[PDB]
Amino acid sequence: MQKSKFRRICVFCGSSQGKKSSYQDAAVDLGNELVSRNIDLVYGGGSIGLMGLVSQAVHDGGRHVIGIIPKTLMVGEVRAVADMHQRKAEMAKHSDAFIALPGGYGTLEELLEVITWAQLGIHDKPVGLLNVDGYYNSLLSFIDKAVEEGFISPTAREIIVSAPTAKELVKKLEE
Amino acid sequence: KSKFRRICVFCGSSQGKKSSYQDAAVDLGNELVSRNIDLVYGGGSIGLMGLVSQAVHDGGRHVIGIIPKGETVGEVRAVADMHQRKAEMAKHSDAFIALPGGYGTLEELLEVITWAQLGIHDKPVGLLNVDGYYNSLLSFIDKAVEEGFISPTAREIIVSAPTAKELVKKLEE
Ligand SMILES: [Mg+2]
């Protein structure tokens, strides 16, 4: 009955699978959730870890997947671009919102960049965390500390949309 | 003598609510000066960024502020966008320190960490963890390690200490 306001969502996520099967479930559920909403996927190009799970899910479901990789390291369209900065820029340019699954330093750096850009008014695209089994709880508490100490405004804290499942998170992103 | 010619300091463009964070910014500024280290920073004169760069300049060391596109002390470098800015800050620096800050400080810190993890540089990366300000962030990285997303080896990229003196001491390594 309602049309999603997103054509494409950019998903940042671990190149590792993680220790808990809940992580892998969440990556598949996110893929299936995008498919159910007629949203295509933009991602950083893995076939391994959670990156491989969300992309394969979206592909299997019949939607299009765009993976964007630096031209050095070599389902769906593969785009190889000059460098890591051009990769992030292209991922951002072609997406209408951003979702982070659990992941390591790389996922976190990508997520913090798009949040900062929203804070600076560079873009207005929704940014959400798929907070499976409280993976991001200490990150969220760190942001609370930053709000309490006056380094982040209560409004800028609200840039991060968070939910424990894909269905809930995508609902919150539509707004 | 320091092994570092320049340290890049990431820090809040806000001054924060606690006097301890502002005194840490000054103390770090004075630490760099005392060890003959020059400063690279994100530019401007506001927040902790203003406090560290003023202390370094006033102490007679060189300051380079790298900005995209208040006033910047020392040498000002204006670059095309925020990607070039972070690239330039990393290229021209020998170690990195994050004071307390918000999203911008975190964004910059995490990219430096990722680049070290990817083998792009091996410059020391330090957190000036004033009054446990970064405790929750460190708990998150530990969770990431426990759940298999960051190796115990890559967790060691992050050096932490509660004061400027102790931190620069650990970075010298
Ligand atoms: Mg090293």
Question: Any overview of this molecule?
Answer:
- Two copies of one chain form a homodimer.
- Chain A is α/β, with parallel strands linked by helices.
- Chain A has one domain (2-175): Rossmann fold (3-Layer(aba) Sandwich), CATH 3.40.50.
- Chain A is built from seven helices and seven strands.
- The first copy, chain A, has helices at residues 21-36, 49-60, 84-93, 105-119, 137-148, 154-157, 166-174; strands at residues 8-12, 40-43, 65-70, 77-81, 97-100, 127-130, 160-163.
- A seven-stranded parallel beta sheet of chain A has the order 4-3-2-1-5-6-7.
- In chain A, helix 1 packs parallel to helix 2 (49-60).
- The two termini of chain A are 16 Å apart.
- The complex binds magnesium ion (MG).
- Magnesium ion (MG) binds next to loops of chain B.
Keywords:
structural genomics, Rossmann fold, alpha/beta, structural genomics, unknown function, homodimer, 175 residues, PSI, 7-stranded parallel sheet, protein structure initiative, binds magnesium ion, 7 helices
In short:
Chain A contains 7 helices and 7 strands, in the order βαβαββαβαβααβα. Chain A has helices spanning 21-36, 49-60, 84-93, 105-119, 137-148, 154-157, 166-174, and strands at residues 8-12, 40-43, 65-70, 77-81, 97-100, 127-130, 160-163.
CATH topology of chain A: Rossmann fold
Give the overall shape of chain A, derived from the CA principal axes. Answer: globular
What's the architecture of chain A, going by CATH?
A: 3-Layer(aba) Sandwich
Cα-atom radius of gyration of chain A: 15 Å
Count of discrete structural domains of chain A: 1
- Chemical compounds bound to the protein: magnesium ion
- The oligomeric state is homodimer
Helix tally of chain A?
A: 7
User: Could you say which structural class the secondary elements and strand pairing of chain A correspond to?
Assistant: alpha/beta
The H-and-E topology of chain A, N to C, reads as EHEHEEHEHEHHEH
List the strand order in the largest sheet of chain A. 4-3-2-1-5-6-7
> Biggest chain pair contact, residues each?
A-B, 40 and 38 residues
What is the helix content of chain A?
A: 40-55%
Strand content of chain A: 15-25%
Amino- and carboxy-terminal Cα gap of chain A: 16 Å
CATH class of chain A: Alpha Beta
Question: Could you give the count of β-strands of chain A?
Answer: 7
Q: Major sheet of chain A: size, sense and barrel closure?
A: 7 strands, parallel
PDB class: structural genomics, unknown function
Keywords: structural genomics, protein structure initiative, PSI, center for eukaryotic structural genomics, cesg, AT2G37210, lysine decarboxylase-like protein, unknown function
Assembly: dimeric
Entry title: X-Ray Structure of a Lysine Decarboxylase-Like Protein from Arabidopsis Thaliana Gene AT2G37210
